[PDB]
Design a protein around this ligand. Sequence first.
Ligand SMILES: NC(=O)c1ccc[n+]([C@@H]2O[C@H](COP(=O)([O-])OP(=O)(O)OC[C@H]3O[C@@H](n4cnc5c(N)ncnc54)[C@H](O)[C@@H]3O)[C@@H](O)[C@H]2O)c1
Ligand SMILES: NC(=O)c1ccc[n+]([C@@H]2O[C@H](COP(=O)([O-])OP(=O)(O)OC[C@H]3O[C@@H](n4cnc5c(N)ncnc54)[C@H](O)[C@@H]3O)[C@@H](O)[C@H]2O)c1
Ligand SMILES: NC(=O)c1ccc[n+]([C@@H]2O[C@H](COP(=O)([O-])OP(=O)(O)OC[C@H]3O[C@@H](n4cnc5c(N)ncnc54)[C@H](O)[C@@H]3O)[C@@H](O)[C@H]2O)c1
Ligand SMILES: NC(=O)c1ccc[n+]([C@@H]2O[C@H](COP(=O)([O-])OP(=O)(O)OC[C@H]3O[C@@H](n4cnc5c(N)ncnc54)[C@H](O)[C@@H]3O)[C@@H](O)[C@H]2O)c1
Ligand SMILES: OC[C@@H](O)[C@@H](O)CO
Ligand SMILES: OC[C@@H](O)[C@@H](O)CO
Ligand SMILES: OC[C@@H](O)[C@@H](O)CO
Ligand SMILES: OC[C@@H](O)[C@@H](O)CO
Ligand SMILES: [Mg+2]
Ligand SMILES: [Mg+2]
Lengths: 254, 254, 254, 254
Amino acid sequence: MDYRTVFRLDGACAAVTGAGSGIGLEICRAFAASGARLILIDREAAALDRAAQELGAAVAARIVADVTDAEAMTAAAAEAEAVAPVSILVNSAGIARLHDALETDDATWRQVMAVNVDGMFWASRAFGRAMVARGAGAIVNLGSMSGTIVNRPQFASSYMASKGAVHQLTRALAAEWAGRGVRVNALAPGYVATEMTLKMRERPELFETWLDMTPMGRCGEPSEIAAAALFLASPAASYVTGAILAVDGGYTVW
Amino acid sequence: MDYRTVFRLDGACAAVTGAGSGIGLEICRAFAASGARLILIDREAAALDRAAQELGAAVAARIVADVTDAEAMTAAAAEAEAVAPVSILVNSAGIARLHDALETDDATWRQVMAVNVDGMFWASRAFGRAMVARGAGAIVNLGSMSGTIVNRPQFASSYMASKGAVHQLTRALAAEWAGRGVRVNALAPGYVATEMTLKMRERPELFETWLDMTPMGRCGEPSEIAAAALFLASPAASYVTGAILAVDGGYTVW
Amino acid sequence: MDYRTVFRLDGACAAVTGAGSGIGLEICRAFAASGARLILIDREAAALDRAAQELGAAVAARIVADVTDAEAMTAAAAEAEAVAPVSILVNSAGIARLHDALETDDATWRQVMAVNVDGMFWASRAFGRAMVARGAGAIVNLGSMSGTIVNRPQFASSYMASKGAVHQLTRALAAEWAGRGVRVNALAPGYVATEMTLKMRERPELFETWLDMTPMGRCGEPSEIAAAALFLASPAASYVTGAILAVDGGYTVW
Amino acid sequence: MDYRTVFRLDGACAAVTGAGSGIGLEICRAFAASGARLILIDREAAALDRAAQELGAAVAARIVADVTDAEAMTAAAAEAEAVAPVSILVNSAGIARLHDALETDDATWRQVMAVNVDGMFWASRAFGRAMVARGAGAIVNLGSMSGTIVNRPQFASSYMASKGAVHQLTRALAAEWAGRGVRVNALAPGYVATEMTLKMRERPELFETWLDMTPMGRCGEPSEIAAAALFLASPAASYVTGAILAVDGGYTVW
Ligand SMILES: NC(=O)c1ccc[n+]([C@@H]2O[C@H](COP(=O)([O-])OP(=O)(O)OC[C@H]3O[C@@H](n4cnc5c(N)ncnc54)[C@H](O)[C@@H]3O)[C@@H](O)[C@H]2O)c1
Ligand SMILES: NC(=O)c1ccc[n+]([C@@H]2O[C@H](COP(=O)([O-])OP(=O)(O)OC[C@H]3O[C@@H](n4cnc5c(N)ncnc54)[C@H](O)[C@@H]3O)[C@@H](O)[C@H]2O)c1
Ligand SMILES: NC(=O)c1ccc[n+]([C@@H]2O[C@H](COP(=O)([O-])OP(=O)(O)OC[C@H]3O[C@@H](n4cnc5c(N)ncnc54)[C@H](O)[C@@H]3O)[C@@H](O)[C@H]2O)c1
Ligand SMILES: NC(=O)c1ccc[n+]([C@@H]2O[C@H](COP(=O)([O-])OP(=O)(O)OC[C@H]3O[C@@H](n4cnc5c(N)ncnc54)[C@H](O)[C@@H]3O)[C@@H](O)[C@H]2O)c1
Ligand SMILES: OC[C@@H](O)[C@@H](O)CO
Ligand SMILES: OC[C@@H](O)[C@@H](O)CO
Ligand SMILES: OC[C@@H](O)[C@@H](O)CO
Ligand SMILES: OC[C@@H](O)[C@@H](O)CO
Ligand SMILES: [Mg+2]
Ligand SMILES: [Mg+2]
């Protein structure tokens, strides 16, 4: 057993949705640094531009696709497989919409569920197919502490519901594919200091409550989430499947 | 503090989705026996008529409606409020479809999610509005042990994902409405001797595994799930909100 | 089943540890009101007398005993059995001590673990023996939200660990005795307005925080814990075993 | 970050209980291969001699002590602190005794709780002191799937209870010390192929059930547990605290 290289992804090809920004991009950084080749997937093709510049030779392909389009995910997987066997998938496309339950537009509910759950299933089915055939693979899904507990003070019931679905989808596929050598796990991050949540701080009433409810008294940095994703994606996690790993500064402890 | 009557529902009106069959119908029987009036909601006209026939005077209204139709849920709640103030909602409309993940029809995924999760939200938003305005109500959602664990050996990853979402939806609404006096809780049943279920033996490996995986070594009876729903619906559960109550013969203990 | 009577305990005899005060005594009131005879167990002779006086004819026996004295629990079960078959046990004896981890004296940690865990086992083994012989019984343990999450701002790591043990002990005995018809479940109450929490409730630095962390914005009343205990002990809960039921005004939801 | 070294422990000194065999020893190998120096802690050498002949220059001190003796732990930290500041603690001492609940002798119960829970608290209190004073530390507790579910078919209620306590202790200390820069996490391993558990092969009425209940269909190798401990001990887990990480081949998913 070589512990010096057990966390590496040498020789792996990893597809990452949401690759162009935030957590997906930092996960790409981690994976690249660890020897993986990348299939970058995003709907914002210029956020892809940014990523490919940074990741250089580690990029095997850049694919523009909406995860909510099942046909487009099946196509992305066929295109990726033609470049190299995809042995890792990271589902890091996810959105959040603030809404009071009683005032929720039907479209808001459907949009969040479609991206966060359905899109995860479309990508997992598409990319998982060849992993299952090969009897080898690792899937890391971006769940949330929102799949375990309910945020405060803001309301976003569709987010909570979608992340509950993400955690059970993770486990469902872990169970179904364990016998065929594909591991499936989720991260459950707390608040993460992405450009996007850091602006969500023009609102001290929200932000101060978030910090006060986190034992570490801070948001997680994107790299702290990526380092956990790297662990779950690597052979270090060879006996880890169907796990929901909290990376939340202690948020779910209280 | 009259413990002899604290589980009763005299003077309350309960709306029940999926009232026509299985667990929803047994819940109706339990609630009627406990003094409640009933708004029966189901997509099947013939089933509703049978249900109404047996339930007699306890029925305040019967509404043929599809829980996946948001507009129909909103109209059902307006109709019900005209006929009786609804202070209890039971979301027992659910479906289950067997599918191997890699062989899943997109429509199968969508329909399971639509009924199990979106429908529960549409009904909860619709009927919950007036509860929240009055500052009083109780909602009981039919979750599942499938919201907590993954069944074996059969595969139904949409069911698992939908039930993860149901458990978190329950909790999100619990948190949002707690200050306005509306409690929202879920049952997580094990295997229950219903149609949904007894039609699966019908693959003879299934039942023997199920029972071997259940400490009590038997399926639950619908009446056993209904008695638990009655607890959560009643004033006995006045300090219970956002709870997921396992009623599974110990299945999730092992 | 007959729902009008499914929550009743007529014909039953329940042993309750911690019967002299608080939740235990309220559970005794609830069980007596529901038709049960009672075995009162408490280390405080004077408190037990007051309880016995109040509870009247419902009291079959009163046993002055320390749950940490395993030999006394053994004799107490033999004494009770000579008087009536005990078919229900409630383990409500329990203590909380505030201590900072680094400034913890060995004896504080020992005593909390001894009363809360060891004593629950001594009493369960003792009273459980004849239930298992008979093929029928129901046990209800007082766990806590502190078996799931960690209280704030006060520290009491021994209490947290003890309640983590209570929850697993509950489930362990549920699994082991399921085949012999003995259900074993736990309640996980949030803050409750008792003697246990009386002083702390005077300190606003603690109490404001407790209320702000509780979605219902109040402690539960003893009767609201007792009503849930009654449910678990009754035939209504006949398919519930190994469950941990949160009765915490939504505390563990956030 | 950088990701090439984020999993390393160069310049750290780690104290490991149960270091002479099984998981504790494999963790020592993992930590040594990652640049750590080691305080080896176990009850009799060798044990520790053969561990030192193996681990070479990595060993800073070898301390013989009983984790159940609160004074031996306090002393042990003091001795270790004289050789090197200890920035990492791994509580890998643990025992399991088979016993049916109704055939349980008091000393069996007390001993399992004393090694698994009390011993963990004494070690954490003792080694935690200097960490909290230095505002930096990481503690990895060996929990178990047995702290989440109940094993089958064998009975060992003290092991389950003790492991529930380990999970909650881990969390309590995470909450208490979050503000003082000490992270505290637990692993929850499934069955691990230590020499001890490999002897069960051997008893196929046990072993074959164990494998049938594990989605991966095999026990984990000690290195698979150690790689996960290394993750939690390392800067890669800097936003992970109060987490229970399942490493169980999916055991707790079903
Ligand atoms: N506080 C937090 O940031 C937080 C908390 C809990 C969970 N998460 C989860 O972590 C993951 C990463 O989020 P982030 O913070 O990096 O986001 P971000 O705001 O930094 O960027 C969002 C990215 O998702 C992409 N995207 C959105 N919809 C898409 C679609 N349909 N198809 C393809 N790409 C799409 C966008 O183009 C963009 O690049 C998400 O799954 C999120 O749900 C985040
Ligand atoms: N083993 C089990 O049967 C089991 C276990 C755990 C949880 N549950 C859940 O409990 C609930 C009750 O189901 P059941 O077990 O009685 O199954 P069942 O087949 O006996 O009854 C299903 C009922 O839901 C109704 N329904 C379906 N779609 C509807 C729609 N769109 N609008 C209105 N009504 C609709 C059907 O008409 C029928 O009356 C479901 O939510 C189910 O997911 C069932
Ligand atoms: N905030 C709360 O009140 C709260 C919340 C969650 C869980 N709980 C748990 O509920 C249970 C009951 O608490 P309560 O509110 O009634 O507390 P209380 O202090 O009001 O009553 C506790 C009773 O237990 C008895 N007792 C203590 N040690 C004993 C021993 N060694 N042997 C026999 N009897 C003993 C005491 O004499 C007293 O009569 C306990 O297990 C407690 O941990 C309490
Ligand atoms: N199947 C498994 O191996 C399994 C499953 C779940 C959890 N765990 C947990 O993993 C951890 C390590 O297990 P393992 O497989 O290495 O066990 P092991 O028996 O192989 O080694 C355990 C070590 O603990 C030491 N120890 C025992 N009592 C001690 C005491 N009183 N003082 C000091 N040292 C003592 C022993 O000397 C031994 O070296 C334990 O905490 C165990 O509870 C193991
Ligand atoms: O949108 C704020 C909250 O609901 C989470 O999605 C954290 O981003
Ligand atoms: O797919 C699991 C199924 O058997 C149950 O949900 C219905 O009984
Ligand atoms: O610290 C948790 C415990 O003391 C509570 O029951 C409050 O009294
Ligand atoms: O440490 C041994 C552990 O695997 C026990 O659960 C065996 O019963
Ligand atoms: Mg919380
Ligand atoms: Mg299980």
